[PDB]
XYZ file of C-alpha atoms in Angstrom:
46
model
C 10.273 39.181 64.243
C 9.113 38.718 67.728
C 10.143 41.505 70.419
C 9.428 41.189 74.101
C 8.838 43.390 76.572
C 10.583 41.617 79.749
C 12.791 38.496 79.968
C 9.704 37.050 82.209
C 7.177 37.780 78.589
C 10.250 35.941 76.588
C 10.788 32.995 78.721
C 6.835 32.878 78.336
C 6.925 33.175 74.669
C 9.139 30.345 74.419
C 7.090 28.204 76.223
C 4.026 28.875 75.029
C 5.979 28.039 71.269
C 7.054 24.580 72.190
C 3.801 23.055 71.228
C 3.650 25.134 68.075
C 1.632 27.368 68.937
C 1.316 30.633 65.956
C 3.531 33.351 67.119
C 0.459 35.850 67.077
C -1.470 33.595 69.666
C 1.945 33.739 72.054
C 2.233 37.133 71.471
C -1.642 38.104 72.993
C -0.681 35.781 75.315
C 2.570 37.145 76.469
C 2.778 40.848 75.843
C 5.385 40.192 72.857
C 4.963 41.698 69.662
C 5.767 40.409 66.575
C 7.133 43.324 63.673
C 7.811 42.876 60.126
C 10.932 44.439 60.274
C 14.259 43.017 62.598
C 15.181 45.789 64.944
C 12.811 45.488 68.317
C 12.553 49.040 70.112
C 14.047 49.899 73.112
C 10.463 49.302 75.342
C 10.426 45.791 73.914
C 14.654 44.676 74.161
C 14.140 41.271 75.129
């Protein structure tokens, strides 16, 4: 599951994903994170 820190970060993440870039690279690019669970924490609410 991906969790993002802000709306901007999410929006950027989604653009990053459009060419098929792995989630992990889009994560470091944006500040979003990949977790194994499905429950994003309050500071990664977006």
